[PDB]
Design a protein around this ligand. Structure first.
Ligand SMILES: O=C(O)C[C@H](NC(=O)c1ncnc2[nH]ccc12)c1ccccc1
Length: 167
């Protein structure tokens, strides 16, 4: 039993809510919040800009040190950093950004990173300003992630569409 509230059950292990992931993080303080990152960990907009803003830019400062030491992530890859005031840890996961012309096939690899964590609060990877089909991303999530994932969808119309079309 955990502290997430008002989530709709999609499958055995995947739940979904129309909510601001930042506000969900502040309320639950999960062990892991997932960031929809890019390979440079430059947290400008979307989930990343929103999470980073909520940390008062501490996420960005930590991320810049990470990149200076390790270089960029791979598309489909991830790293574990601090969750700052939002969570114990932040799992920065790079899904493909279709508006950058990146390989849609790497979305499954991106979701595989979730399987290293028993429970996660996460956004829908590659959706929103990342430009992929969100119905497709949800199918990949449910078909790839085996651990317990609580998906927070910001856009109300998007949430309603995702629920109403889910197989
Ligand atoms: O769920 C959605 O609508 C799509 C989602 N976007 C956000 O979660 C989001 N975007 C902008 N400002 C925000 N402030 C608090 C949350 C938030 C998303 C998923 C994957 C990549 C990029 C974006």
């Amino acid at each position: 039993v955990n502290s997430f509230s008002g989530y709709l059950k999609l499958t055995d292990n995947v739940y979904i809510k129309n909510a601001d992931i930042v506000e969900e993080a502040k309320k639950v303080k999960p062990t892991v919040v997932v960031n929809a990152a890019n390979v440079y960990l430059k947290h400008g907009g979307g989930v990343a800009g929103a999470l980073n803003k909520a940390t008062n830019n501490a996420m960005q400062v930590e991320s810049d040190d990470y990149i200076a030491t390790n270089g960029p992530l791979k598309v489909g890859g991830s790293c574990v950093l601090s969750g700052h005031n939002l969570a114990k840890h932040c799992l920065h996961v790079v899904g493909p950004n279709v508006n950058k012309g990146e390989d849609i096939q790497l979305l499954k690899s991106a979701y595989e990173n979730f399987n290293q964590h028993e429970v996660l609060l996460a956004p829908l990877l590659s959706a929103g300003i990342f430009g992929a089909d969100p119905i497709h991303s949800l199918r990949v999530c449910v078909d790839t992630v085996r651990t317990n994932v609580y998906l927070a969808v910001f856009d109300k119309n998007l949430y309603d569409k995702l629920v109403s079309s889910f197989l």
